Amino acid sequence: GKITFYEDRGFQGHCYECSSDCPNLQPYFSRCNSIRVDSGCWMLYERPNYQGHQYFLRRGDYPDYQQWMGFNDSIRSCRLIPQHTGTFRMRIYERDDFRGQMSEITDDCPSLQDRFHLTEVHSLNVLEGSWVLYEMPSYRGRQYLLRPGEYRRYLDWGAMNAKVGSLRRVMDFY
169 with 156, same domain? Predict the structure, then answer.
């Protein structure tokens, strides 16, 4: 994968290219107002060390930060999410610590309220593939990257609440 961050809108200004995870981009550019993704699926973060608002991006041109739903022009770390081929599988639970009713999800889910009659998920286990969890249905609101592993409580995925409105598998167009 390859992503280039530009300091000004419209691909202008100083830029920097990243081809792998970068935990602290502060030494390479001071603000980010446009990005070109040449390849790969990436999760961008507002602060270093993969914290703050997160944003998912795939190949394409993004001439302004609103194109990636950015909160502001701060991009201080990024992860290249490994491509997973085959089945994506996660289990969601009604309560924390993997309690209550569990449901297994192996496809994209644009509305957990519509499919499961749930507006909150209190724990989840991602068994295969990486996914992006969205606060609101139809892939809206705050985004959270979920990589394989156990998430015993909402805090584990970085959220300040347990609302989960949709889930998308991280898959490249090809």
Answer: yes
